[PDB]
Design a protein around this nucleic acid. Structure first.
Lengths: 175, 218, 150
RNA sequence: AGACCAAUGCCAUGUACGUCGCACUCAAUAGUCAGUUUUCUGCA
RNA sequence: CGUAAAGCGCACGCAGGCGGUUUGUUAAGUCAGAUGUGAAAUCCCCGGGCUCAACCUGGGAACUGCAUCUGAUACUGGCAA
RNA sequence: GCGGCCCCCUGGACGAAGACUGACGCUCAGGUGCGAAAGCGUGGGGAGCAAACAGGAUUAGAUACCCUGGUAGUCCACGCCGUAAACGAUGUCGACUUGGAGGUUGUGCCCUUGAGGCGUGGCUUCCGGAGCUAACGCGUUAAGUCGACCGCCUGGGGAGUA
């Protein structure tokens, strides 16, 4: 249905106000762009989000993590009680990421993808499984995670979600 | 919602044949945009733009020419939204990565500026650092609190800001442009045939857009 | 399920002030095995950095192909720069029988049994670019019937 | 603006670019049967 | 076939090649079917015999052609307007 | 290829409205014609310029560049030659395919209210879009998208030579 608009007579009046003969009538073929899908989320946008998120994961920069006890981190400005809640298992992860067996480079990309996905889908808590390694994903991944601005807090996952081989991660989401 | 009052089209010079569907085009060598075509176009732009504004999205007004400033700062900042009013840096969307650390330096230097150690250790270097806040503040002004790359883009001139349109088309961002008769509907998803360089026209125009961005059901 | 493979590495040169400087270019093609083919060029100072930039560019910039059962649909000709390329669906015409640098893109593309014959130039950087252009403008019986009504 | 400035043994040039790893142990539940007869036991 | 080899120095024009548009007729090209022929072997297909294979062999297909007859008339040609 | 002005003879193009013929068209191997300059033949002419030539310099040399002279030639009539980076290095004819700024030559309409405004043809210059192209670039005057006919190409040299 036609949208509400000024009357055709009113448009003619506007045409009348137009100084001079004041009418343009060039006729040309018209092309209209297809309407964007409501779902959207094109693979290219997803790839871009992933790349943006993984950009923060530097191998040269090592955040100071607590050396005593289970691995944990809380971003400055976030309530310290959040890490405690992660430890107690108050948070139930909605997304699970398995990194075991990936190269560092692959893992960074997947982590980025995970964070992007959490943001997109408004998922606040995710589980990251890195397995057990020395100077491997098990050690490097927490450092990378800390460097990410959207990561609020993480803690060694409870036994139900993989224990010492996994992390629960809290992700900052716009709601 | 109100009928476009006072602009009726412009740009005698460098008119673009791809604007031929939108031109009435009579008076004194200058081209008149058919505003009876503009009103459905602009109502559609308010429709989809309000549709993404209600999904809690980020809009990024783009206002480099004058006087789109501070009209884009006034209109974006009248909403809880974002803007670019000085020179749009080549690649603040397509490498937002590097622009993220420049925004990070703007935050760290304003926190260092009005609260922390600003008078500390030097006068000359302190002056140097403050004018780094003028340069990083006017270039990365509105976008400094965004924290993502935005869900739409609203440019105020399509040929003057072709870089931003080219990047938002590169990234799959809906471009909402007020084109003039010299501009080109490149990848502008929601074209609006209007007048780019009249301050009455862009304040009416951004008034309507900023009205529908924050429009509240309440 | 990524299925990456490299086609060509070369040593290019630059000729600066003091002697020459030698750089290496890779050219790889990735693809999942069911449409979804990409190629990437990538150039760097050593060979593993070159192939890594090539893979990383090829994982993005990946194109859909409308395959048949395991193969092409109609015979298609793709051209790029000097490199003209024919392909024929070969409805279970067994085995991928294509030229070098076309066998690879058709292999990771997910097609199994086509007939090819590159003509013209057969530079590997342009014979893909003439296979994707080719597989890109090959359309399916549910796309042609979508276009023309039925 | 616009004098004058000729030539420059013989070869092969190269090595050379092909990539990885992790682990681990603490607990219940042998056997125990019975226990004279009663009764005042502050008060308003 | 601008610059890699390759546009006659430029024209006029015969033989040649090609020829706007409508209707009617013809049916030469074209198309369809039929008949005669296109030797046998060889190639191909389905079988059979040598212990298998090579080999030999039964039947078919094929020999993409030519000639004649019967039709079709959209396109090309002939003729008339 | 054609440059003072005038006359005579003469070819073509383009535009405006109308009338007429009615496919009479396009290309073209062999064939024929025209074809800069230099050159050749016969007869004139010959101011300037100038191959050759001579002298002076320059130079290691200088059969050159530079200087001073200077003949054929350049000019006319008639005949020959038959070629050039004879080049938009782009055959001819026709059709279609976004634009902008000019130049030049017609014509129609509108207050011509001026050195205007709106169109519609012919030829031409510069820049550019899609498209094409190895790239460079071409780009409604195509090197785009097609059709008709012709000419030509097939590694460099030897050789466009014997």
């Amino acid at each position: 249905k036609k949208k509400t608009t000024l009357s055709e007579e009113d448009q003619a009046l506007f045409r009348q106000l137009m100084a001079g003969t004041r009418k343009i009538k060039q006729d040309t073929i018209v092309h209209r762009p297809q309407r964007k899908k409501i779902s959207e989320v094109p693979v290219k946008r997803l790839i871009q989000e992933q790349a943006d998120a993984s950009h923060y994961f530097s191998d040269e920069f090592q955040p100071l993590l607590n050396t005593e006890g289970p691995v944990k981190y809380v971003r400055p400005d976030v309530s310290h009680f959040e890490a405690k809640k992660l430890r107690r298992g108050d948070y139930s992860p909605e997304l699970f990421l398995a990194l075991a067996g990936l190269t560092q480079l692959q893992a960074k990309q997947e982590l980025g993808a995970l964070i992007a996905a959490c943001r997109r889908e408004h998922v606040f808590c995710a589980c990251v499984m890195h397995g057990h390694g020395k100077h491997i994903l098990k050690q490097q991944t927490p450092l990378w995670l800390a460097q990410h601005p959207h990561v609020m807090a993480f803690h060694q996952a409870p036994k139900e979600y993989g224990g010492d081989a996994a992390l629960l991660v809290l992700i900052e989401v716009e709601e | 919602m109100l009928k476009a009052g006072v602009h009726f089209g412009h740009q005698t010079r460098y008119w673009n044949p791809k604007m031929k569907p939108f031109i009435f085009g009579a008076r004194n060598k200058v081209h008149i945009i058919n505003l009876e075509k503009t009103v459905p176009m602009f109502n559609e732009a308010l429709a989809e733009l309000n549709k993404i504004a209600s999904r809690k999205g980020k809009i990024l007004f783009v206002g480099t020419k004058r006087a789109a400033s501070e009209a884009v700062k006034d209109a974006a900042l009248s909403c809880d939204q974002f803007f670019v009013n000085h020179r749009w840096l080549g690649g603040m969307l397509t490498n937002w990565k590097t622009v993220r650390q420049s925004i990070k330096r703007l935050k760290d230097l304003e926190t260092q500026s009005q609260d922390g150690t600003f008078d500390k250790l030097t006068k000359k270097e302190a002056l140097m650092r403050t004018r780094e806040l003028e340069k990083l503040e006017n270039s990365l002004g509105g976008i400094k609190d965004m924290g993502g790359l935005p869900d739409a883009l609203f440019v105020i001139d399509a040929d003057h800001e072709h870089i931003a349109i080219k990047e938002a088309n590169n990234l799959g961002i809906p471009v909402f442009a007020i084109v003039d008769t010299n501009s080109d509907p490149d990848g502008v998803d929601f074209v609006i045939p209007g007048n780019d360089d009249a301050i009455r026209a862009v304040t009416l125009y951004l008034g309507a857009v900023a009205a529908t961005v924050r429009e509240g059901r309440s | 399920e990524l299925q990456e493979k490299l086609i060509a590495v070369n040593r290019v040169s630059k000729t600066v002030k003091g002697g020459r400087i030698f750089s290496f270019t890779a050219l790889t093609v990735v693809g999942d095995g069911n449409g979804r083919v990409g190629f990437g060029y990538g150039k760097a100072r050593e060979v593993p950095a070159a192939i890594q930039k090539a893979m990383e560019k090829a994982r993005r910039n990946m194109i859909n192909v409308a395959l048949n059962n395991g193969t092409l649909q109609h015979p298609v000709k793709g051209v790029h720069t000097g490199s003209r390329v024919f392909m024929q669906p070969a409805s279970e015409g067994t085995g991928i029988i294509a030229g070098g640098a076309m066998r690879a893109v058709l292999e990771v593309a997910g097609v199994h049994n086509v007939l090819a014959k590159a003509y013209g130039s057969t530079n590997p950087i342009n014979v893909v670019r003439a296979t994707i252009d080719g597989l890109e403008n090959m359309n399916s019986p549910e796309m042609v019937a979508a276009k023309r009504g039925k």
